[PDB]
Every structure is written in C-alpha cells, then in structure tokens.
C-alpha cells in the first residue's frame, strides 16, 4: 500500500462531474476500518 498524503490519515474522492455521486474514501492502514455488518443480498430486476 501507498502512504496517505503527508499530514493526512485518508483521502476523500469528491465527485466533481456526476452531480448525483456520493464520496469515496481511501485508507492506507487496515487497522483504520472494522467490518461491522455483513449484508447478504440480491440486486433486483427493475419492473
């Protein structure tokens, strides 16, 4: 893995074209996330 930018713990990817997109985030240390919920699902075919 890379390092975070100096003086930062993560990167925020702010969407700047698609006005409907929400943010995406990057961490560089595995210890900075805990997998709290496991969700089992199907995608649904639109009507």
């Amino acid at each position: 893995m890379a390092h975070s930018p100096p003086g930062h713990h993560s990167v925020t990817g702010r969407p700047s074209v698609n006005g409907l997109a929400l943010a995406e985030y990057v961490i560089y240390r595995g210890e900075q996330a805990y997998p709290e919920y496991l969700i089992t699902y199907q995608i649904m075919r639109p009507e």
Binding site: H9, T12, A21, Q32, P35, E36, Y41, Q42, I43, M44
Partner: protein, 161 residues
Amino acid sequence: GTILIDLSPDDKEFQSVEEEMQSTVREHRDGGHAGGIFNRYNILKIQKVCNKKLWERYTHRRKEVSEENHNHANERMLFHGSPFVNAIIHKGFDERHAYIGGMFGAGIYFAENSSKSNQYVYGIGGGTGCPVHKDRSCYICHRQLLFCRVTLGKSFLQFSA
C-alpha cells in the same frame, strides 16, 4: 475469533442498515456494466461481525488518529465490496485487500453509495460476474457487501471525475 450474529428484520439495527443500503443506490456511468442493472436490493440477511481482537486493533488505531486530530477520529459508516469479504471478516483489513490500481493510489477503498461497492463484489469492474452464471447483472446469485466503521481522521480532499 469471528462470530456472526444474525439480526432480525424486526430489529431497529437491521432496519437502519437496510435503509442505508437501499437509499444510497444510484445510477452508474457504465449503464450497469460492472454491477448490474437495478434500482434496489432484496436484502436476505444482515449479520453483525464480532471479533474482539479485530475491534481492539481498530479502537487502538482510532485513538492514535484521534489524538493527532484534535480528538476527532472522523469516523464514518461506509460500504466495501470485495471478492475477499470472507477473509476480511476473519482476519481484518490489510494490504491484500488494497486496490493497487485505484484513482487515489494503492489503498483500501470505501463508498458512501452502496451501488458503488456493489461494482466490486465480483472483482474490479465486476470481473466476470457471478461464479455460477458469469453474469455481472445476475439477479439470482447471492451477493455480500460489508458496512464498515472507518476512521478517516484528517482527510485529503481530491476533487475528481
């Protein structure tokens, strides 16, 4: 060390996690190529992931980050999709779970949009789709996402397409 506890659909915790999953679906610029064509999910199960060692690893790091950032962990709840979700829940996140070729460098990527993480369930770009039918838009096969607690601390803001 990991145990999985089923949540009941009647539990407020199941309901609030389902709502986050459903309400953060969006359309994607690939027309559904990677993740499939859908507006919503059929949630089959939600389980709490309980691992004392992994939790302590997380909270230890959270305190370090917090003390470097005026007592602010900047903790978020975010989605993660990966072919390795079964390894993550048993061993935690590490360098093997990084997106080496990601837009923001080799790190572990998380999304606010559940449908963004859904694009990675079968690999980068949806890989070859589901194991059974090789269909990235499979409506039959069962998928898994993680809804994760993530410490951002001081986050570097990247404006981007």
